[PDB]
Scaffold this motif. Sequence first.
Motif, PDB file in Angstrom:
ATOM      1  N   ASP A  34       0.847  -1.192   0.000  1.00  0.00           N
ATOM      2  CA  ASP A  34       0.000   0.000   0.000  1.00  0.00           C
ATOM      3  C   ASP A  34       0.884   1.244   0.000  1.00  0.00           C
ATOM      4  O   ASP A  34       1.168   1.854   1.034  1.00  0.00           O
ATOM      5  CB  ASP A  34      -0.947  -0.017   1.193  1.00  0.00           C
ATOM      6  N   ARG A  35       1.326   1.623  -1.197  1.00  0.00           N
ATOM      7  CA  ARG A  35       2.092   2.845  -1.382  1.00  0.00           C
ATOM      8  C   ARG A  35       1.812   3.392  -2.773  1.00  0.00           C
ATOM      9  O   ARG A  35       1.381   2.665  -3.673  1.00  0.00           O
ATOM     10  CB  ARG A  35       3.594   2.613  -1.178  1.00  0.00           C
ATOM     11  N   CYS A  36       2.064   4.687  -2.941  1.00  0.00           N
ATOM     12  CA  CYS A  36       1.726   5.361  -4.182  1.00  0.00           C
ATOM     13  C   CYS A  36       2.647   4.924  -5.317  1.00  0.00           C
ATOM     14  O   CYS A  36       3.759   4.437  -5.106  1.00  0.00           O
ATOM     15  CB  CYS A  36       1.799   6.877  -4.005  1.00  0.00           C
ATOM     16  N   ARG A  37       2.156   5.108  -6.541  1.00  0.00           N
ATOM     17  CA  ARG A  37       2.905   4.819  -7.754  1.00  0.00           C
ATOM     18  C   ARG A  37       2.759   5.985  -8.718  1.00  0.00           C
ATOM     19  O   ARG A  37       1.761   6.705  -8.692  1.00  0.00           O
ATOM     20  CB  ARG A  37       2.415   3.531  -8.423  1.00  0.00           C
ATOM     21  N   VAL A  38       3.755   6.165  -9.575  1.00  0.00           N
ATOM     22  CA  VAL A  38       3.704   7.225 -10.574  1.00  0.00           C
ATOM     23  C   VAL A  38       2.910   6.737 -11.777  1.00  0.00           C
ATOM     24  O   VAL A  38       3.094   5.607 -12.246  1.00  0.00           O
ATOM     25  CB  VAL A  38       5.123   7.658 -10.978  1.00  0.00           C
ATOM     26  N   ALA A  39       2.018   7.585 -12.284  1.00  0.00           N
ATOM     27  CA  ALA A  39       1.201   7.211 -13.427  1.00  0.00           C
ATOM     28  C   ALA A  39       0.835   8.457 -14.220  1.00  0.00           C
ATOM     29  O   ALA A  39       0.987   9.587 -13.751  1.00  0.00           O
ATOM     30  CB  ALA A  39      -0.066   6.465 -12.996  1.00  0.00           C
ATOM     31  N   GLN A  40       0.364   8.230 -15.443  1.00  0.00           N
ATOM     32  CA  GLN A  40      -0.157   9.282 -16.304  1.00  0.00           C
ATOM     33  C   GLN A  40      -1.616   8.983 -16.602  1.00  0.00           C
ATOM     34  O   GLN A  40      -1.945   7.879 -17.051  1.00  0.00           O
ATOM     35  CB  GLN A  40       0.638   9.378 -17.609  1.00  0.00           C
ATOM     36  N   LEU A  41      -2.486   9.954 -16.355  1.00  0.00           N
ATOM     37  CA  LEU A  41      -3.914   9.782 -16.580  1.00  0.00           C
ATOM     38  C   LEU A  41      -4.379  10.710 -17.695  1.00  0.00           C
ATOM     39  O   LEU A  41      -3.928  11.854 -17.793  1.00  0.00           O
ATOM     40  CB  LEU A  41      -4.715  10.029 -15.293  1.00  0.00           C
ATOM     41  N   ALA A  42      -5.273  10.203 -18.538  1.00  0.00           N
ATOM     42  CA  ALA A  42      -5.797  10.962 -19.663  1.00  0.00           C
ATOM     43  C   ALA A  42      -7.126  11.611 -19.300  1.00  0.00           C
ATOM     44  O   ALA A  42      -7.932  11.051 -18.553  1.00  0.00           O
ATOM     45  CB  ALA A  42      -5.971  10.063 -20.887  1.00  0.00           C
ATOM     46  N   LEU A  43      -7.347  12.805 -19.845  1.00  0.00           N
ATOM     47  CA  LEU A  43      -8.544  13.585 -19.565  1.00  0.00           C
ATOM     48  C   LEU A  43      -9.669  13.327 -20.561  1.00  0.00           C
ATOM     49  O   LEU A  43     -10.714  13.979 -20.474  1.00  0.00           O
ATOM     50  CB  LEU A  43      -8.206  15.077 -19.550  1.00  0.00           C
ATOM     51  N   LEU A  44      -9.483  12.401 -21.501  1.00  0.00           N
ATOM     52  CA  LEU A  44     -10.498  12.167 -22.523  1.00  0.00           C
ATOM     53  C   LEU A  44     -11.694  11.405 -21.960  1.00  0.00           C
ATOM     54  O   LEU A  44     -12.819  11.915 -21.947  1.00  0.00           O
ATOM     55  CB  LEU A  44      -9.888  11.412 -23.706  1.00  0.00           C
ATOM     56  N   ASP A  45     -11.468  10.181 -21.489  1.00  0.00           N
ATOM     57  CA  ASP A  45     -12.527   9.320 -20.965  1.00  0.00           C
ATOM     58  C   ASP A  45     -12.213   9.003 -19.505  1.00  0.00           C
ATOM     59  O   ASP A  45     -11.386   8.138 -19.207  1.00  0.00           O
ATOM     60  CB  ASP A  45     -12.665   8.048 -21.805  1.00  0.00           C
TER      61      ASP A  45
END
Lengths: 117, 118
Positions: A34-45
């Motif tokens: 239970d720890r954070c991870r780096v990610a990229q999220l898209a604003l489309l859907d």
Amino acid sequence: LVTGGATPELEALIAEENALRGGYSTPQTLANRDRCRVAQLALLDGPFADLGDGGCYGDLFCKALKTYNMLCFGIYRLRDAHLSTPSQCTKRYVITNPPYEFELVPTDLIFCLMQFD
Amino acid sequence: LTRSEAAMTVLSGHVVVCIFGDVSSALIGLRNLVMPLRASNFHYHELKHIVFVGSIEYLKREWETLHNFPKVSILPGTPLSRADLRAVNINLCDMCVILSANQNNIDDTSLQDKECIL
């Protein structure tokens, strides 16, 4: 942030044998995930799509933090998004810590820290 | 002696010789170390077991001189690896001899004992 939360105890365990040894799952072991991870999220859907069309970056940051405990710290933006004419170049550049009044576009990615689920 | 069988074997009151050698390394005369330890004025029950921790490629060059001694064992590995040191019962040994078998190293002089110090 970059190595995956390397810990001194793991360093000692590696140093003893110069390898990674398997271990049976225990609740305290399974709670290490239970720890954070780096990610990229898209604003489309997504739930944030409404903020994609000209919304403030600060509103997106606050909404994500309150709802999903998601920390947004940067915008990956198309290089020619600011240009009026359409382009085929998909290269994107990084904007670090945009201000509250920054204006989003639908073709943006958001750097985020995801909590484990 | 592989790690598992060396661990299975019990070694108490023995001698552990940790050597840093390669195929092209200079040959230190290891017979000059084992031979005084087998001097025929020690009873056979008083002889100390000698375990060589180092490259087997290097020790193959000296086994032709060391093969005529009663109790000598070899653990192919590295003196800087804690797994081999724990497998050979380093805490129960009478003596640990860290030898700069790669003495032919030509460098800055002070950086000639780096492996021994480490």
